[PDB]
Design a protein around this ligand. Structure first.
Ligand code: CDL
Ligand code: PC1
Lengths: 58, 93
């Protein structure tokens, strides 16, 4: 709406594009930079005692 | 023909009922823990940290896809709740 040039300038982040640097608010550290609980807090609490939360990835 | 127990064994056997009761209670406790941790998963799932990096990624790929990828790709401006009670970021900052 403000302008195609304005949008292009806003989107551009690096002068040299040969390097990929994804934007991240923070970098994972625990569990070798991974997430053990990919769930909500409620799900994490309940799934340890209630069936149906696990989807049996087989 | 007095086929009685040896003296040391007979002396030892006095405390055996306590051992039997202890085994009963311990087996009950262990089985309760096993069932509680088995029913939700239908198995004794290995600890997440007891796995390789690739194994962890493979295990959590499906959960990530089901919980974040699909809402992220099906997102609409009016799907988010006005109360700001949205799902927390995967890596909370
Ligand atoms: C009088 C008037 C009448 C009054 C009426 C009152 C009201 C009546 C009820 C009304 C409502 C009925 C509704 C029915 C329909 C809805 C049902 C529903 O929603 O459920 C479906 C819901 C989901 O459905 P589903 O997926 O199809 O279920 C299939 C299975 O889940 C699939 O199983 P799985 O393949 O996944 O395998 C795991 C499963 C399999 O696990 C098992 O449950 C199997 C058995 C495990 C080992 C049990 C050992 C017990 C003894 C240990 C040693 C104790 C010593 C010390 C005490 C002294 C004992 C003399 O385990 C679990 O799921 C985890 C549950 C863990 C249970 C906790 C331990 C139970 C014992 C509690 C002991 C308490 C302390 C001692 C008290 C001492 C008192 C003197 O199923 C369940 O979650 C089932 C839960 C069952 C819990 C255990 C039930 C007892 C089992 C028999 C043992 C009884 C012992 C009593 C001792 C008494 C001594 C004096
Ligand atoms: C003087 C009195 C002495 C009393 C001694 C009693 C000692 C304490 C005993 C505690 C253990 C009792 C276990 C009984 C079986 C419980 C089964 C159960 O909850 O099912 C799990 C199952 C788990 O199944 P699930 O995990 O598949 O549930 C999810 C199901 N989907 C996926 C469909 C959503 O839960 C349910 O059935 C769901 C409804 C639960 C409703 C609430 C149950 C509360 C039970 C309280 C029992 C209190 C007994 C008090 C007796 C007093 C006598 C005077």
């Amino acid at each position: 709406v403000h302008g195609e040039e304005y949008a292009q300038k806003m989107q551009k982040r690096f002068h040299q594009t040969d390097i990929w640097a994804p934007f991240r608010h923070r970098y994972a550290y625990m569990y070798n930079s991974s997430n053990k609980n990919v769930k909500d807090y409620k799900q994490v609490t309940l799934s340890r005692y209630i069936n149906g939360f696990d989807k049996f990835n087989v | 023909v007095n086929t009685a127990y040896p003296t040391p064994l007979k002396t030892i056997l006095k405390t055996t009922p306590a051992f039997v009761v202890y085994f009963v209670f311990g087996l009950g406790f262990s089985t309760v823990i096993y069932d509680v941790v088995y029913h939700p998963k239908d198995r004794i799932e290995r600890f997440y940290f007891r796995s390789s990096k690739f194994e962890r990624l493979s295990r959590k790929r499906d959960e990530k896809l089901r919980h974040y990828f699909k809402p992220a790709i099906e997102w609409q401006p009016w799907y988010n709740t006005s109360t700001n009670n949205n799902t927390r970021p995967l890596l909370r900052y």
